[PDB]
Design a protein around this ligand. Sequence first.
Ligand SMILES: Nc1ncnc2c1nc(Br)n2[C@@H]1O[C@H](CO)[C@@H](O)[C@H]1O
Ligand SMILES: [Mg+2]
Length: 390
Amino acid sequence: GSMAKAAAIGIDLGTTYSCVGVFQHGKVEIIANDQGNRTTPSYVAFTDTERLIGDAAKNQVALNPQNTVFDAKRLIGRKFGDPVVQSDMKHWPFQVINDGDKPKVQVSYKGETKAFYPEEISSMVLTKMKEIAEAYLGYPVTNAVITVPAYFNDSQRQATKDAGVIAGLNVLRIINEPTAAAIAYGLDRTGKGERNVLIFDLGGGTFDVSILTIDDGIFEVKATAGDTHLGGEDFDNRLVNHFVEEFKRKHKKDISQNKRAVRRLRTACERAKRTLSSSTQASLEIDSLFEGIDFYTSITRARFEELCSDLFRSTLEPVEKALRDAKLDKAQIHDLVLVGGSTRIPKVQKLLQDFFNGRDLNKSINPDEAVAYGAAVQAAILIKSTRAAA
Ligand SMILES: Nc1ncnc2c1nc(Br)n2[C@@H]1O[C@H](CO)[C@@H](O)[C@H]1O
Ligand SMILES: [Mg+2]
């Protein structure tokens, strides 16, 4: 009669990391890639012989900086002349060129110089998320919901859809990241009456706060605020500067000019930063860091909290601005939702909870997975084709 339908997937197409989920048997499964990772770097690398996507691209970035593309989401649907684009280009080791006032990334690939639109790079990331899902399901996937930031305009939303079409996906819907995070907690299934939800999204490079109103499952974005210069990478930089100074004191050597030693230090710092979210201290153990000197040291959670204290406190300014813009008081917020791996930082949680006079925070769904979780829930709802009974 009628063949069973393939499951639809939910993709969080992130600036730095992407995540894929599927809703089956009344629950969401976040799908790990072939290296066992639940999130995949939004990186595409080009060589003379291969195109690498995800973890394989990110793991060779150090020796191939000019031909490894990341941050395509900061370029999607924007004009080359845009002041956001011009400022960002100074931080990127890859070439961004102007083609009819549209940015394109230019790389060496398979013996030739090739330029790609940002939607073409994003389609390569979406192709990898589709293959991750098909490896788990064991059949081809066609249907997907893809999420975007709430501040994305029509051009940025259309370019995201275009990336989906290039990847061979049927895009069911483009949904806002804060809406997907609310759906993950079922905040649209609480019945009649207005609820005010604050989403606190602290990423690798940016911070976004959104205030949504939910009435009978209908979402309205009331206010958005944030800091484009605040994220996980800034906390990593604070530890890097700290250990560079520590090496100077202990061995009387300045390492800041050996890129390999700095990179090994930064890699070790990001891991120590993660350990400090569950432990009160963390060890740093690098062999032959500089001039055959081994760097074996430690950092307490209290010292790390001191090093990033101004940065953590600055997350409350966009919160107060969003609340003023929404014309609401903090007591009027019904639910608080955490999004992004950097929200696992206990001090970040403590500051926000204290700001909302001890209120519980929704953090039960892994914050780096909540957006894809909500997108998978929506995708399963959008493919239902039930016919009314008599
Ligand atoms: N447990 C964690 N504690 C502290 N930080 C974390 C954690 N997990 C993740 Br993931 N991060 C950081 O989140 C950002 C995601 O783009 C990166 O800067 C990661 O370092
Ligand atoms: Mg995100």
